[model samples]
Target: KLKDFGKTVPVGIDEENGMIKVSFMLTQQFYEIKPTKENEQYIGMLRQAVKNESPVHIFLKPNSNEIGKVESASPEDVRYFKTILTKEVKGQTNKLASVIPDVATLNSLFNQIKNQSCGTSTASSPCITFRYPVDGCYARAHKMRQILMNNGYDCEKQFVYGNLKASTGTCCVAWSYHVAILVSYKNASGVTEKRIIDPSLFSSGPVTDTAWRNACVNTSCGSASVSSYANTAGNVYYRSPSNSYLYDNNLINTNCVLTKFSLLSGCSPSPAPDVSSCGF
Candidate 1:
């Protein structure tokens, strides 16, 4: 009766090794199960579930890590799960709402977390990875949410999209959508300010919401015609409220990667000069 709930992540089938390696966005752990002819359909279902960004209930075989069955969650279940998650996230915010930290404290925390970033080198913290192939903003935001919540801080997520691209002439960062955590605090004048904590973009410290947005489309580095913006609790990891891929229309599957941005569209020089003409 072993059970796990979460969205299935990248899965690989190793025919030579006779094993199916599966991971989850929630659990962030991989499981290896023997692949048998009878289990082919279940594997197919898992792949479909990933395609749909649907939650699942996985039951494991008795006394083994191998998967015995997989249940694709219904819409109602997904909605209920989201509702509960939202309430819990609200609780986290409420815990710090009345006690919003001062600007200094917020800056300190920002630097603390930013210092943990992987940056251009190897990763130093599991919760922070901002190195090469700077994708997986959703996962990074989620993990950062956990860290912030555990430390009794209020955290929210900010998502921006629409032909977004950032480049340093040598390399590029492009996404149809991107996300990072936001923290609110009182500035020197006792005015509330919401700052975005995205070390990948600002390595020194947190930046104002406007600055962060500008960095996404800074004319000097890259270009963007932003079309959509969404703000949600840190607990939310998908565009779909029901925890199903029913509304993730912006995502495009390119080179086995589900991304909102296109490498061919904005970051190439031959087809279009990098950072010059970004939009397709």
Candidate 2:
């Protein structure tokens, strides 16, 4: 016989798509009841009775507190309990699967980054020139700075420019902890090309968080927008020219430079762990 149970109703709403999903989980405790042919028939009968009655009441045994008590069971309690049992029989519950990004998407992104950097030579000149007013750019530089610092790079001289400091003819000398490749593209007017530092290079492997942060804070490209991973990566993956060789005079020019020092060695891949419910 069932003695106690906890019930829960879960409602999920997808704000973006305007969809609503609902589910319920029921738990029950039984005492003095054994699984037998007669008991199963009795359970079926109770379930049918609940469906026909459509009861909304819940029952509480009166004066029952310490496991045993003399009290009258209300009609409402029987009706509600029966409904709960009937609902369980209707197959309205399921275990939830974990939400995870598809592996194929991650693999594709990894390949894109690898392909972009392949065969690209480090520029002899300073990689970054003429800092832009993009927030995304600066964010990436900051993250890069952190990565550099963690990897034992001296990053003392990186200058952060945002507060309307007029540019002097003199250029600042910032110490490099790690090497970062800035990918740039020229507009129809070669003078006004867009430049962005790559961030996927630091997403995994030997890049440290400290070096990534310093690089981002010190490096100034266009607005902070250039530093944002989504904006920079998105532009490279979607908008930027493809198949044309990097550093070509017409497309990227000498604008693609190594903003910082190269790592002692190429970083090994460090993929993130997967924790999808499918494993269980």
Candidate 3:
């Protein structure tokens, strides 16, 4: 028998909200990555679990390094986690069918998103239009998050202020008006964690802490209030009690030009989103 099953951490592929989180502690803190072909292996296994088959894991990874495992789960735990994968499977799949597989969608989105900013060519496509963390971010982020759910990739909304440097008094204040999604995926070694899958923004993330900071800049911290989004309504409800669209316009875009991104539709300026459980 194997010397050990390494250390058991509380990690799993979140199917409902598309959040895959693996943590050493209940308060998970490991880094996360996406399950793209290049970045991760055995994506097929995750796809299998998504299909509602026998969600058996049978063992540990080569290394016993991180938290949350798919193997060694009791039949009860295995079944429960499997349930998470099937929440919206059938109907959602028919609705989301694309010539592009969900995996290819990632590739196409990245190719398109990485190269363009807002323009005529970009505006027409639902895939994305602008390069910054701007409009349609919340809804589209949610939509993409759902598409991932089709394949068993875990994800969730991250209400945030864009570009920390602008918000942290480096240039701006933490407006915390925008939204992004956080998805969880594992590493080559089978360790898992949660990170941002911010297709709404130009970048494709499983953004790392340091990498995020470097991209927009960060200090010891930006704003403490930002920390409150999780603790608020549903662990997902992120709107402040009085947070409205116009009232917080300046919060997310202190320094960036607002020519595009976050516009209502037709790329027109509009008020902020309304809130509920899927609150703005």
Candidate 4:
């Protein structure tokens, strides 16, 4: 049985400013896989390949298993185990990035680039607007979609009656290029629940001043009051202040604090493992 591992440091924080910070740490583990000669050779190859990858760290563990088990283990089983490990590492990296608040730094940095090169005598110093309705807005939506997709959620664009319009892309300042995402899933009990994620949660960098005002008026994204509806379907619906639409309240509340904090802090570097392990 696995012994109790100590707690990990907080990786992200969501704050009132609507930004999320994420933290990451490098970790390594050694496993006593079935050690047939072929498996041993494969392990050697895997170790070398991992070393070649950037941002990788390693550690070793003493063998505790007997020779018989190692020799009898199938090469396929060993390969499967190694693949799982690789996937876990990749997932960790992406998860760290998702909650990192430092992503917002991209805005300030990019703006700096635009300001420095906006107007210069040379053709290379062409003016760049980083226009929201045009470019940056789409980029922001794409990023939000990526986050949802990573979490095994499906996302798509839908239109709601508001200051924004879909076909013309001509929207009031608050609605321009504004996108709404709906996430739905069936739980293990086979009951379906759906949640609406506001664009503001993911669109802070692009929405112009006017658009923000209009969008925030009647939803959690704005100053509008919200109402809750309890239902027998194991889901609760939240109505926008204007009653324009409803969203799953349960989904909104789950990890809501964590989500809010993540948006605020941005991504954080993974902390080093606690030294408490030494006691064991």
Candidate 5:
């Protein structure tokens, strides 16, 4: 479930047709007003909430990016919703997908994603071409989440905040915060285990949440202090795509120039992707 609440509600007309776009500060995404009989009332509530800078909650549609409902909320509701978001991401809820991949399938999926570099060099099921280490993780996480969800796997984002560091390729990255795609499933013992796909830290395959955190805070890697963390549904973080193709191209191109450094550091695609048309 994707939910958010705050006083920073910004509204605007999406186009000449007068379709409205409402946004919250946290996700930085302009969400369209899905047409409904209750839209007028909801718009009025949204307007009042914005004018008073009052807290409001939004619920996004299932399997879609559009906001399906909105409500005026209290400050306490804000805290409650925030807690729910974290719980949902931490595998407390099974809302995104019905079929969760086993650890072995997760490893295969991870390798497929791991083989490709930021520059398109492979024709594979999971090819990510977003530059890493320097920055643009939000975009990378977005794409990864989309891919995972599309493949019938449950995915969310785990964001850690604090002065943190990790090594990618041959470069050390300094981040006050970082976000990555996470998928969870019950093990043979019926214990829920969380794994994260963060190429910034691990190259072999997805690592457990504990392993990922430990590596980030390991003194051997860099100066590290973890003050806090939060988990949110994958789509809850960034821009709602107006045009998916353009959105994807922009996302892929984000920080692509910096991949030259990654390439120079010898982080190109492994074993050379099947030489095929790399065009989208």
Candidate 6:
């Protein structure tokens, strides 16, 4: 018997962080329900409300602690996630192959984001951070997440913590509030593999968990290395990398060269969708 389930709903996108976030709290004053037409009607309304509350396919994270704390999405979200749930996947019977990002596509994306940026010590370090939009990290991540999701990969957003102690002389510097997307695709092993993807962080294709751990620089100020990885909600509000407790390993690309190019140049007014002039 569900009883006293309610919430305070707001209207519109989160203006401050630009991510769509909300919390559903249930006050447990329980009671049984009677079999009445009104009760059935109420149940119908409740289901409709949930459908209406859901913003198409956007994933909502709960604010109990972290991870799903921030929610954002659009009419075109979760295109691929909903698909992989079924054990059987249908092929393009009479059509061309699926347009998922291939080696060539990944290379194109690489060239688009890769740059000879100048925020590091030298004039041009391994600049992989791209000229992204200036709408904060979450928005940028969501935008990119949507791109990948629409293209057939399962993508999700992560509001993680960055330990700048590697570059900076301090830890927990400011509110190291950073957001990135976790992208997953079918690897050569015939399984769906994922990587924490943020152009401003790792750009040589999807990076490994070790690389992500090492790349946890407090971009909120300074930037580098870490001792371990954590997946559970980190007590530190800023948060930790996804591989915190995850013990899976199928990747070895450890050239995660996160630099100060992003903090220095900031994001462009909009994403640089073209790589015709990028320093590939």
Model 1 lDDT, residue 49, Cα: 58
Residue-level lDDT of model 1, residues 1-280, one tens digit each, is 6544333332222232567756443221234556778877778877775555445667666544467777777777667545433333322323544224697777777666765554323324342554432455665565555556556776777877555666544567655566788887888888887888887677778788778777777555455556566777654564432232211112221111212222223233211111211111
- Count steric clashes of candidate 1: 2
Model 6: per-residue Cα lDDT over 1-280, one tens digit each: 2211122111111112322222111100011223345445433333343344332211122311111112333334433322322223232222222223444554443343333333434324333333432223333443343344334443434454422222222222222234455544456654655556565565456675556545555455443323333332111111222221211011111011123224534433222121112110
Report clashes for each candidate as comma-separated counts.
Answer: 2, 55, 12, 33, 0, 7
All candidates: TM-score: 0.52, 0.18, 0.35, 0.22, 0.50, 0.34
- Which candidate, 2 or 4, has the higher lDDT? 4
Ranking by lDDT: 1, 5, 3, 6, 4, 2
What is the alpha-carbon lDDT of model 1 when measured against the actual structure?
Answer: 0.53
Tens digits of per-residue lDDT, candidate 3, 1-280, equal: 2223222223233321233322211111122324444434433444444344334442333333222233444678565544432322122222332223343444544344333334435443233333333233444443444445444443445544322332222223222244455544444454555454453322453464334334333443442222323311112322322231111111222112222333433312211222211211
- Which run of 10 residues does model 6 get worst, by summed lDDT? 246-255
lDDT tens digits by residue: candidate 5, 1-280: 6543323343222321356656432232235674467787777777775554445666656544356677767778556434422323222233567335467777766765665555556634234443445444555576666566556665767776555666664655544456788878667676677889987677778888878776666566655777566776555443212211112233343234233234433323321121112111
Give the clash total for candidate 6. Answer: 7
Model 3 lDDT, residue 274, Cα? 20
lDDT of 2 by residue, 1-280 (tens): 3222122111111111221111111100011122345445433333343334322211112321111111223576555434433322121022222111333323333333333332334322322222321112222243333333233321211222211111112322211112232322223444322222343324342233334444443435221211222222211111111111101111121222222212211211111011111110
Model 1: residue 273 alpha-carbon error in angstroms: 26
lDDT of 1 at 126: 42
Q: Give one digit per residue, the lDDT tens place, for model 4 in 1-280.
A: 3222222211111122332211111111112334356445534433343343211122222222111111122456445434322322111122222121232333432233333221333212212212222112222333334344444333333322222311112221222123333434443455544443333332233333234334433343332311222211111121121222222222322223222222221111112122222210
RMSD of every candidate to native, in Å, equals 14.0, 26.9, 19.8, 22.0, 15.1, 16.2
Query: Which regions of candidate 2 are displaced past 4 Å?
Result: 1-103, 118-280
Query: Candidate 6: which stretches are off by over 4 Å?
Result: 1-135, 165-175, 218-280
The candidate 4 region of ten consecutive residues with least summed lDDT is 21-30
Give the winner by TM-score: 1 or 5: 1
